[PDB]
Amino acid sequence: MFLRQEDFATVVRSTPLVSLDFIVENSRGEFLLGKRTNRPAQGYWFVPGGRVQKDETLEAAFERLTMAELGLRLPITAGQFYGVWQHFYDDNFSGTDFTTHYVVLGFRFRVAEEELLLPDEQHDDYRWLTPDALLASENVHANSRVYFN
Amino acid sequence: MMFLRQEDFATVVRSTPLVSLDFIVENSRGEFLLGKRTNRPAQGYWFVPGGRVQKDETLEAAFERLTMAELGLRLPITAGQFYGVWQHFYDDNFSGTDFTTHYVVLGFRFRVAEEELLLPDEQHDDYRWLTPDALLASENVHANSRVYF
Ligand SMILES: Nc1nc2c(ncn2[C@@H]2O[C@H](COP(=O)(O)OP(=O)(O)O)[C@@H](O)[C@H]2O)c(=O)[nH]1
Ligand SMILES: Nc1nc2c(ncn2[C@@H]2O[C@H](COP(=O)(O)OP(=O)(O)O)[C@@H](O)[C@H]2O)c(=O)[nH]1
Ligand SMILES: [Ca+2]
Ligand SMILES: [Ca+2]
């Protein structure tokens, strides 16, 4: 259920979003971050992830979101559950007039870089970063840095 | 902003998953608390106490608000044992049968002293402390509560 703009605005204004964030490792002990082109956390390096839709199972969401974010569909069985997190932003997808709140389910998994097809819709660049490098940069959003604390 | 007007809550339930905390509440003898629900969804079923997280509310704050509202006893989230992520889908909703309800649920288990609760009558018309074997044997205990045991 991909909502029309009016109803997505009302939803974001009124209730927490539920999302899956992906802690994606390569063959070198590095993790995938993309530089976000959408609000919230626009212009920051952030892990790939997205919200779960109405009446969508977590199993279905994991497949839809891995395909949408990484260009590679993976089943939820590939992910290692990595906690429940909470992300609060002062802005939203279409403005700076109300806040966004996510309750986030983290999942960690390792992939082969050559099997991904990284899309350009939500990020304008992608890097595989070591925990030390990502923790040392203010350009990586705090909500992504904490996964590596 | 937090407790929504009915109009806004209806839009939310129609359009996106709710995020809730369900409480697996044990007494000193190893029995667990179930209430007979007076509201939709799962109306008329025995169910664990629990409720949804509000916009811009931390999970820590929601746990305190919800234990107080559900049990008459405020407990901190540190008292709870994380008990998994679950998903509950219902064909009806708080206002009737016009649309479905979807919850992404964070389970928490903890023991209380029965004598210290002040069980409210707003959401349940009866309460029982049941053994796992007993609650598992009854179709009047909703499947979404039975699975915790
Ligand atoms: N109109 C609309 N936009 C959405 C919906 N869900 C997500 N979006 C937007 O679609 C894009 C991708 O969604 P998602 O990956 O879930 O969002 P993220 O938290 O920004 O990474 C972002 O620009 C979101 O703001 C929806 O139901 N309706
Ligand atoms: N108007 C309104 N009602 C709500 C809201 N959140 C929950 N409710 C209703 O308030 C009561 C208690 O909420 P909760 O414990 O979260 O619901 P449960 O899932 O039915 O146990 C139920 O009747 C819900 O339908 C809200 O933001 N606005
Ligand atoms: Ca995304
Ligand atoms: Ca409740």
**Cross-chain Cβ contact B106/A99 below 8 Å:** no
- Tell me the residues of chain A between 55 and 84 that have a Cβ less than 8 Å away from chain B: 55-58, 81, 84
In the block, tokens 């923790």 appear at: A135
Reduced DSSP (H G I as helix, E B as strand, rest coil) percent helix, strand, coil of chain B, to 5: 25, 35, 40
- A116 contacts A31 by C-beta, under 8 angstroms: no
Distance from CA of A101 to the nearest CA of B (A): 6
The candidate with the shortest Cα–Cα distance to A18, out of A106, A95, A89, A96, is A106
Q: Where are the domains of chain A?
A: 1-149
Provide CB contacts within 8 A for A67, sequence distance 6+: A73
Peptide bond preceding B49: is omega within 30 degrees of 0, i.e. cis?
no
Distance from CA of B1 to the nearest CA of A (A): 7
Nearest residue, CB atoms, B100 vs list A8, A53, A55: A55
Which residues of A44-138 form beta strands (DSSP E)? 45-46, 49-51, 80-89, 100-110, 123-129
Question: Cα separation of A83 and A86, whole Å?
Answer: 10
- A140 contacts A45 by C-beta, under 8 angstroms: yes
CA angle A85, A87, A93 (to 5 degrees): 140
B90 lines ligand 2 (CB under 6 A): no
Provide CB contacts within 8 A for A60, sequence distance 6+: none
Question: Cα separation of A83 and B142, whole Å?
Answer: 27
Q: Provide CATH code, domain A1-149.
A: 3.90.79.10
**Cross-chain Cβ contact B16/A13 below 8 Å:** no
- Element of type H or E holding B111: strand B101-111
DSSP A29-60: S-EEEEEE-SSSSTTSEE--EEEPPTT--HHH
The burial of A16, by beta-carbon neighbours within 10 Å (0-12 exposed, 13-18 middle, 19 or more buried), is given as buried
Question: Cα separation of A32 and B95, whole Å?
Answer: 43
B116's tokens? 């210290």
CA diameter of chain B: 43
Resolution for the entry shown, Å: 1.4
Ligand 1 centroid from CA B57, angstroms: 21
The burial of A142, by beta-carbon neighbours within 10 Å (0-12 exposed, 13-18 middle, 19 or more buried), is given as exposed
User: Annotated binding site of B for Mg(2+), which residues?
Assistant: 50, 70, 123
